[PDB]
Amino acid sequence: SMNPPPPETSNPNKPKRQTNQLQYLLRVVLKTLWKHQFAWPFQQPVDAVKLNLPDYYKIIKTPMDMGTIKKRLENNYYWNAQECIQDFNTMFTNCYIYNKPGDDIVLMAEALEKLFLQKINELPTEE
Ligand SMILES: COC(=O)N1CCS[C@H](c2cccs2)CC1
């Protein structure tokens, strides 16, 4: 079995910014979800070898996880908040696509997504 290369977290060709919204995405949004009891399956790319999921990357072609998001935020990979928000939504959508309704992992994603929505609802206006 083989995992794909992880999503990139560094690209010197890519223009970068540090905006107040991106600071909020790290200091509030990521930190809230990262410390949650249900964060652990989402803190790194899905390891299809260790978890014995040989079809995972046959099904999921745009992988995303909070370890990648954390690195992107800490290394100022993004230009805007919408890129980061899209990464979180990709992570949740992948989980709902691959897994079955009512699975433990889906209940975990739902709890994290609820908090995500609560925090993004108060995303600050851009400075
Ligand atoms: C976000 O992680 C995933 O979607 N995976 C696909 C199968 S569910 C599995 C897990 C189930 C219960 C704990 S961990 C994690 C890996």
UniProtKB/Swiss-Prot annotation:
There is a cross-link at K58 (Glycyl lysine isopeptide (Lys-Gly) (interchain with G-Cter in SUMO2)). It comes from the Eukaryota. The record marks N99 as: Acetylated histone binding. Phosphorylation by CK2 disrupt the intramolecular binding between the bromo domain 2 and the NPS region and promotes binding between the NPS and the BID regions, leading to activate the protein and promote binding to acetylated histones. In absence of phosphorylation, BRD4 does not localize to p53/TP53 target gene promoters, phosphorylation promoting recruitment to p53/TP53 target promoters. Residues 17-123 form the Bromo domain. Ubiquitously expressed. It is found in: Nucleus; Chromosome. JQ1, a thieno-triazolo-1,4-diazepine derivative, and I-BET, a benzodiazepine derivative, have been tested on tumors with success. Treatment with GSK1210151A (I-BET151, a I-BET derivative) has strong effets on mixed lineage leukemia and promotes myeloid differentiation and leukemia stem-cell depletion. The NET domain mediates interaction with a number of chromatin proteins involved in transcription regulation (NSD3, JMJD6, CHD4, GLTSCR1 and ATAD5). Belongs to the BET family. Chromatin reader protein that recognizes and binds acetylated histones and plays a key role in transmission of epigenetic memory across cell divisions and transcription regulation. Remains associated with acetylated chromatin throughout the entire cell cycle and provides epigenetic memory for postmitotic G1 gene transcription by preserving acetylated chromatin status and maintaining high-order chromatin structure. During interphase, plays a key role in regulating the transcription of signal-inducible genes by associating with the P-TEFb complex and recruiting it to promoters. Interacts with p53/TP53; the interaction is direct. Interacts (via CTD region) with CDK9 and CCNT1, acting as an associated component of P-TEFb complex. Interacts with RELA (when acetylated at 'Lys-310'). Interacts (via NET domain) with NSD3, CHD4, BICRA and ATAD5. The interaction with BICRA bridges BRD4 to the GBAF complex. Interacts (via NET domain) with JMJD6 (via JmjC and N-terminal domains); the interaction is stronger in presence of ssRNA and recruits JMJD6 on distal enhancers. Interacts with NSD3. Interacts with NIPBL. (Microbial infection) Interacts with bovine papillomavirus type 1 regulatory protein E2. This interactions may serve for the tethering of viral genomes to host mitotic chromosomes allowing successful partitioning of the viral genome during cell division. It is linked to Cornelia de Lange syndrome 6: A form of Cornelia de Lange syndrome, a clinically heterogeneous developmental disorder associated with malformations affecting multiple systems. It is characterized by facial dysmorphisms, abnormal hands and feet, growth delay, cognitive retardation, hirsutism, gastroesophageal dysfunction and cardiac, ophthalmologic and genitourinary anomalies. CDLS6 inheritance is autosomal dominant. This is Bromodomain-containing protein 4. It comes from Homo sapiens (Human). The gene is BRD4. The chain holds residues 44 to 168 of 1362 of the full protein.
